[PDB]
Design a protein around this ligand. Structure first.
Ligand SMILES: Nc1nc2c(ncn2C[C@@H](COCP(=O)(O)O)OC[C@@H](O)P(=O)(O)O)c(=O)[nH]1
Ligand SMILES: Nc1nc2c(ncn2C[C@@H](COCP(=O)(O)O)OC[C@@H](O)P(=O)(O)O)c(=O)[nH]1
Lengths: 215, 211
C-alpha cells in the first residue's frame, strides 16, 4: 500500500519507483492502486457471501441449507495461469474479512478440469485475471453451470476491458478497469514474460512479438 | 510489519488480535515468512545472475546465453499448495532483478517443452519425507535433461527425511509436526491464512468430506 512514483528515466522509458520498465508504454495501475482495490473488493465479496447459505456437504446427513463456514466454504475457481498471483493475494484478503473459502484451479486457453466434485447447490466464485472479449468467461460460466448447477455462479475479475467486448458478458465483481489495450504485469504476460511485475502496464506495440520462441 | 502473537480468553492462539482455534502454536508469522523469502530471493538471485544456459530465443546462436528476458530462469511450481508461495516469491525475484517464467505441475502436467540445457528451479511448499521431490527431480532430469535442477522450498522438515533428498534452498526449518496456513492446509482449509501454525492433532480429521 506504499505510494508509488511514476516517472521517466533519461532514455525515456516508463519507470516506477526508480525501476525502469522498457516494455511499458504507460501505467494502468501501480501496486498500491491494485492492492487498494483488492482490499475493498475483498470486503465487497465478504459482504456478498457472508450471510449466504448453500448445500451441506460436510454433513451429508443434514437436509437443511448450511451457512458459509469452514465446514462448507465458498468455492473459488481460479483460472490458470494469469490468475494465480491475483488469487493468492485475494484469498488472503478474504481471510482478513473472515470469509471461509477453498480454491481449485482450471487451465483454459481459447483443457484441465477441476478436482472438486461437489459444486452442485454450492455458492461458486470464479477468479479470472482479465475479461476482454468476454468469450473465455462466457464459455466458462455456461460450462460450469451445465455440469454442476451451483446455487450461484459469479465472476470476479482483477481487470475488466469492457471496450473489447464481443459477447454479452458482465463480471459481477470488478477490481480495476483498463482501456482496450494489451496490458502486462501482475499476472498479465507476453509469452510468460513480465508476469511477476508488481504493476499493470500498457505494453508497447513493438513488444507484442518480442518472444515468439516456444518455452 | 511485525506480528503480535498472544492468547485470548480461551487459550486459543491469536495473531494480531485474530484467534486461530485450530492452531496449537505459531511456526512463523507473516512478517518472518516474508523476511525469509526476501533474503531467499537475494540468495537465488546471486546464484543464477551470472549463470548461462541454452539460447532458445535465438536458435541461430550456438554459444550459451545469460539469464535474461530472452532466456529466463525456468521455474516449476507444484499445485496446489505452492501457488501462494510462488506468487510472492517471483515478485521478490523481480525486485532482485532475476528474469524468470513459471509453469505449474499438479502432483498428489508441464506445458513447457524446452527445458533442455536450461537452468531449472523447482518451487515447493514443503519437504518432509522427501519422496515427492525425489520423484519429481528424477522425472524432470531424464525427461527434459536440464543444465541444472535445484529445489527451493518454503518449509523444510529435515527430521522427516526417509529418502536421499536435500533441497538446495530453504526458507524456513520446522519440526516434524503437521503445519497449516500460507499454502499448507487440511482438505484445502486454512490455506489462505497469512501465517504458519502447528495444527492441533484433533483438527487433523475435522473435514473428512470430499471436495
Ligand atoms: N496479457 C494479456 N492477455 C490478454 C489480455 N486480454 C486478453 N488476454 C488473453 C487472455 C489472458 O489469458 C492468458 P492466455 O491463455 O490467453 O495466454 O484473456 C482472455 C480474456 O480476456 P477474453 O478476451 O474475454 O477471452 C490482456 O489485456 N493482456
Ligand atoms: N498441510 C501440510 N501438508 C503437508 C505437511 N507435510 C507434508 N504435507 C503434504 C505432503 C503431500 O500431501 C499431499 P497434498 O494434499 O499436498 O497434495 O507433502 C509432503 C511431501 O513434500 P514429502 O516430503 O515427499 O513427504 C504439513 O506439515 N502440512
Amino acid at each position: 500500500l506504499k505510494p508509488n512514483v511514476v516517472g521517466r528515466d533519461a532514455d525515456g522509458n516508463v519507470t516506477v519507483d526508480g525501476r525502469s520498465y522498457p516494455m511499458a508504454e504507460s501505467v494502468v495501475a501501480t501496486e498500491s492502486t491494485i492492492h487498494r482495490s483488492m482490499k475493498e473488493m475483498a470486503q465487497t465479496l465478504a459482504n456478498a457471501y457472508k450471510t449466504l447459505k448453500h448445500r451441506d456437504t460436510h454433513n451429508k446427513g443434514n437436509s437443511a441449507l448450511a451457512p458459509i463456514t469452514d465446514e462448507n466454504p465458498l468455492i473459488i475457481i481460479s483460472v490458470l495461469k494469469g490468475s494465480y498471483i491475483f488469487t493468492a493475494d485475494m484469498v488472503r484478503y478474504l481471510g482478513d474479512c473472515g470469509l471461509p473459502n477453498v480454491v481449485d484451479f482450471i487451465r483454459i486457453t481459447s483443457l484441465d478440469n477441476l478436482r472438486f466434485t461437489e459444486l452442485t447447490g454450492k455458492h461458486v466464485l470464479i477468479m479470472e485475471d482479465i475479461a476482454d472479449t468476454g468469450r473465455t468467461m462466457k464459455l466458462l460460466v455456461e460450462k460450469i453451470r451445465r455440469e454442476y448447477r451451483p446455487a450461484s455462479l459469479k465472476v470476479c475479475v482483477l481487470v475488466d476491458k469492457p471496450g473489447g467486448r464481443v459477447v454479452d458478458f458482465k463480471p459481477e465483481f470488478v477490481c480495476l478497469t483498463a482501456p482496450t489495450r494489451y496490458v502486462v504485469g501482475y499476472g498479465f504476460e507476453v509469452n510468460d514474460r513480465y508476469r511477476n511485475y508488481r504493476h499493470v502496464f500498457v505494453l508497447k506495440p513493438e513488444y507484442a512479438k518480442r518472444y515468439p520462441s516456444k518455452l
